[PDB]
Structure 1
Amino acid sequence: MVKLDRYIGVTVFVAILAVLGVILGLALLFAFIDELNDISASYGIGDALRFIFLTAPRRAYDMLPMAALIGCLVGLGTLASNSELTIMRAAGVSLSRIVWAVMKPMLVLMLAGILVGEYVAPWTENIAQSGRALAQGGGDSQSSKRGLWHRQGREYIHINAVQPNGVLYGVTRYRFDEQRGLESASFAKRARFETDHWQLEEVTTTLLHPRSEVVKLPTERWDAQLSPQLLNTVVMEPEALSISGLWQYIHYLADQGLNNNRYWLAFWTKVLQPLVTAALVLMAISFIFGPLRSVTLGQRIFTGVLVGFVFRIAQDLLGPSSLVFDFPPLLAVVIPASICALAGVWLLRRA
């Protein structure tokens, strides 16, 4: 059972690769279509291309499960289109054997895909959003999306972007006298936290009362807590964080007593992704390729896309609802995966 297993293995493998190629191409195409309302004449089509193509290694990982479902459907769809699968099972080979032969290249592309997306996606993505924001509207005291406003005593602080590395980007320090006269307005590009104090870098403090001094190194005057929940409201979504970053952050707010369940959920959708994909395509292969009736390839891929979008909606509703009611995050991703798995098993026994 080596020649058939390598046959379906290579077929499903190259099928998943091609599907990922086309889907990634269309995704980048629409991203470029959508990023055409943002040009401020500072940088447009070129910075667009740089942003999109730096985001391609990220988007490939987000596309890997769908490319795996559709890919397996293209493999077994092309094999069953030429009547090879019907006679393959008409000779003693059960359907479960075919499901495993299809699932091994999937497990290879998912186990290999999670470390590719986690080692290559966060870096290229950080460069992408960083450069895009900087040329688009970065360095400004004001930041799009969300920037943190806080008041300490008679001092007003705005943060352009809080990164989950303990670094604050775009720190404005508005220091008025009691009389409200601005005795100093300052700006800092980045800030580092070290034990007892906040140490700012690339700082520019300007005021003209009886100069515009520029200090590049630490300034420590924040007795404010700048609480980890206040900062936690402004952290970027756990999508960009590495898997290890999700673990260390999960355990970062756990020590502070802050709750960390969204990050547990993303952690488990990240770690158990080959499993939920394996169950999804198990149920799909069982349901679509089960009956002996000949089905065209477009109908197979179409109905499988319907399955993938339906269960996609299922997890999308079942996550927020999983943690608003404070359940364990593991069963959140395990229960739908086990439903697709057991449904695929019962469909296998139906045949």
Structure 2
Amino acid sequence: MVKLDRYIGVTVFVAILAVLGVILGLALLFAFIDELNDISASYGIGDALRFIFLTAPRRAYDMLPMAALIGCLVGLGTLASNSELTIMRAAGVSLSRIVWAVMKPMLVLMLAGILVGEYVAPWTENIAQSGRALAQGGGDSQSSKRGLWHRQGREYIHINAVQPNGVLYGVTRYRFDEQRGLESASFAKRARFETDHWQLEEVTTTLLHPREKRSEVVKLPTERWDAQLSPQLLNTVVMEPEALSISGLWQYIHYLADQGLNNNRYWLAFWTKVLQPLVTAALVLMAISFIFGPLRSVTLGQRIFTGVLVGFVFRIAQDLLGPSSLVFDFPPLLAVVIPASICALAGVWLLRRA
């Protein structure tokens, strides 16, 4: 069955691609509207556009499981409402063969999703969130909100921005002992990593004797703060855990396992980026089940509306069940397993009733 497979396959594939185009398109727009709130001074409308745009590859990877659902619904309803599926069934073609015919392009779709979310999304997201971090906040010691804070019992530190090549910017640190003589303070400029220690440049460490003396600032272009945090760890810590690649998430999970810190938040992202093909398969199975059942004779508008409503409930569920794995102690694997399993079971049941 070659000609029929190509006809069911081109039709669902063009539709999934068109729905992802509208959804990536609206979402990038809602994002620009939000960014406009903070465009001020350093950030310019033109620069914000680079961030909204270079974060596109990530926004797409996230929406592939929703774009696939809605596109399958539309592109299979355009064949079901024209009575072109009853003909296939009455010619001797089973439902399993139709499901496989729909799935064959979608298996390529999820392969492309894996390749992009592993090789393209981290790079473009890192470039965008490094450029924006540099722009919004290069100038002042505590002003930037993209800055990174680290903790020591003696001292607490803030670095305004980081760049992938090595250059670093804007650091303010306050070091307090129980005694805490205010001998020095910290504000700093560029810190190209200099061998082992970051070189805080143009520091205005505020120097004073606490009980009775004046405070003076001394700036050294070679002043060094040694690295509790190394450069790579610095790249990973600033990045959102969802934006890290799978090969990076595994290394960071095992690194946190070695040091004894909790990595349960980093397991959820790993499972989400690994089990995504299974979630897409479950969603499209449920969509095919919907087409053969309740939505066989409804119009395009009802199918699109039904798709959005079910899709929303799915995402919100995955957002209730996601961060609840930390509030209530259950394995983070269930957070991604449960909703896809529920959708697959519902689709199987509705296919069985036929």
Smaller-chain TM-score range?
0.7 to 0.9
Whether the 8 Å CA contact 1:176–1:184 is kept in 2: the answer is no
Change (3 A) 1:148 1:36: closer
- Greater Cα shift, 38-47 or 187-196: 187-196
State the shift of 1:28 in Å. 1.6
- Greater Cα shift, 179-188 or 310-319: 179-188
State the shift of 1:303 in Å. 1.1
Query: TM-score, normalized by length of structure 2?
Result: 0.80
- Counterpart CA distance in 2 for 1:151 and 1:56 is 33
Change (3 A) 1:57 1:233: closer
Task: Spell out, residue by residue over 1:8-33, the C-alpha distance to the aligned partner (whole angstroms, 9 max, x if none).
Answer: 11111111111111111111222222
Whether the 8 Å CA contact 2:65–2:280 is kept in 1: the answer is yes
Change (3 A) 1:128 1:212: farther
- Counterpart CA distance in 2 for 1:192 and 1:158 is 16
Change (3 A) 1:304 1:8: same
Tell me which residue corresponds to 2:333.
330
State the shift of 1:67 in Å. 0.9
Whether the 8 Å CA contact 1:197–1:220 is kept in 2: the answer is no
How many residue pairs get matched?
351
State the shift of 1:142 in Å. 2.1
- Greater Cα shift, 146-155 or 33-42: 146-155
Change (3 A) 1:258 1:164: farther
Change (3 A) 1:152 1:278: closer
- Counterpart CA distance in 2 for 1:206 and 1:10 is 68
- Counterpart CA distance in 2 for 1:312 and 1:78 is 26
Whether the 8 Å CA contact 2:198–2:227 is kept in 1: the answer is no
Whether the 8 Å CA contact 2:184–2:207 is kept in 1: the answer is yes
Identity percentage over the alignment? 100
Change (3 A) 1:130 1:148: closer
Tell me which residue corresponds to 2:190.
190
- Greater Cα shift, 50-59 or 286-295: 286-295
List alignment gaps of at least 5 residues for structure 1. none
Whether the 8 Å CA contact 2:173–2:185 is kept in 1: the answer is yes
State the shift of 1:105 in Å. 1.4
- Counterpart pick for 1:299 among 299, 302, 311: 302
Secondary structure at the counterpart of residue 77 of structure 2? helix
Q: What RMSD over aligned residues (CA atoms) do the two structures have, in Å?
A: 4.7
Whether the 8 Å CA contact 2:286–2:347 is kept in 1: the answer is yes
State the shift of 1:340 in Å. 1.8
Whether the 8 Å CA contact 1:162–1:234 is kept in 2: the answer is no
Change (3 A) 1:209 1:76: same
Tell me which residue corresponds to 1:349.
352
Change (3 A) 1:127 1:148: closer
- Counterpart CA distance in 2 for 1:220 and 1:6 is 67
State the shift of 1:317 in Å. 1.3
Whether the 8 Å CA contact 2:154–2:175 is kept in 1: the answer is yes
- Counterpart CA distance in 2 for 1:97 and 1:217 is 73
Whether the 8 Å CA contact 2:16–2:72 is kept in 1: the answer is yes
Whether the 8 Å CA contact 2:137–2:146 is kept in 1: the answer is no
State the shift of 1:196 in Å. 7.8
Change (3 A) 1:215 1:340: farther
State the shift of 1:215 in Å. 13
Tell me which residue corresponds to 1:47.
47
Task: Spell out, residue by residue over 1:283-328, the C-alpha distance to the aligned partner (whole angstroms, 9 max, x if none).
Answer: 1220233258511111112112222111222222122223433333
